[PDB]
């Protein structure tokens, strides 16, 4: 029963194509709740769920000029990295950033986060104990330097296990109806000839929520990591999620194979055979 | 640096025709972030198709939902078309009901 | 809501 706010943020450099594209997007657990996108019209924080909808103009717009300074910290970082890594201003290039806060059931803050990444590689992380950063290369280090002698881990913390830690419980309690259900997945197997002499047993997995969840297939008890396609885990597009786990098989042995689901809202794991 | 991205066609729900549903196209595992993604019916470019916002995994590859609603003709073919600098050319997934 | 708070890299 534990719950998370992250928020993400994606800036790309666009040489002589104008300035960086930039999009951030918050999320309580697995649920967009705000987006700002700065190739859209409305240059705003948006709300993406029901329950944010009720927060007032002074919301609005302090998210809006939060996420607005945010983008101007990412456009000049563009420009220092290229610096850092010894690059010249033709190529993109790309930073991201993902910081939040995980509570338990109960409201209690459990830990908070922050990562950076320079063209979709480790930059620079926040530690666990949120005293302390570690730097992934010599150029990162030099930022390391910087946001130690600024005392930045102090500001941060601050907000990640205090600030988002009171937003993430205003909103469990506004968003209620709807972020504490949890949906069981449905479960089915199907049955592909790929031959004469060979078929395809897929298992599915349907309609569950939260996202997590693991599908195995087994073949007389001992298992067959190697012998398994397993599609990443995608979303329905109302809210749900879907995966499928598939094993290609000899006809006429299907009975020797079993699936096996796990997800949290499942009371016991599940277990299919054709 | 550079990652193709996965690419995976198919509906909301499962598909019966006549009845208007979902049809999505789930691109990730990519890096760099551009990328081109159309739907198709019968090797024509859908008009209304919405996408998600960018956002990313934990091992900072990108994913994004394209979707359209449609209603399935057992006639009508539909793909997701997707461009990206790691394919020599724009990759064609075809949408099995099976997958 | 995020975080109001940015030092430059």
Known sequence: ?????????????????????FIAVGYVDDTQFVRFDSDAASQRMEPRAPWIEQEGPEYWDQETRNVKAQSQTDRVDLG??????????????????????????????????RQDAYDGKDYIALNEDLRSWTAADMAAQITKRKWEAAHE?????????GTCVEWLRRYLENGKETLQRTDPPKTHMTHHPISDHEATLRCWALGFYPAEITLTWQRDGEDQTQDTELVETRPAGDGTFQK????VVPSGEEQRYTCHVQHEGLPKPLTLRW | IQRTPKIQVYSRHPAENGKSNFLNCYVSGFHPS?????????????????????????????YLLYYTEFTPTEKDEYACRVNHVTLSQPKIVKWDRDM | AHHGGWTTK
């Open chain 1, 80 to 113: 220092t990295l290229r610096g850092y890594y010894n690059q010249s201003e033709a190529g993109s290039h790309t930073i991201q950033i993902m910081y939040g806060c995980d509570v338990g059931s109960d409201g209690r803050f459990l830990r908070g986060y």
């Open chain 1, 1 to 21: 029963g534990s719950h998370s706010m992250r928020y993400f943020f994606t800036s790309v450099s666009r040489p002589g194509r104008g300035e960086p594209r």
């Open chain 1, 153 to 161: 881990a102090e500001q941060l913390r601050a907000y990640l296990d």
């Open chain 1, 244 to 247: 499928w786990a598939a094993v």
């Open chain 2, 34 to 62: 551009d990328i081109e993604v159309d739907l198709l019916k019968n090797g024509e470019r859908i008009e209304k198709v919405e996408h998600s916002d960018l956002s990313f995994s934990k091992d900072w590859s990108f």
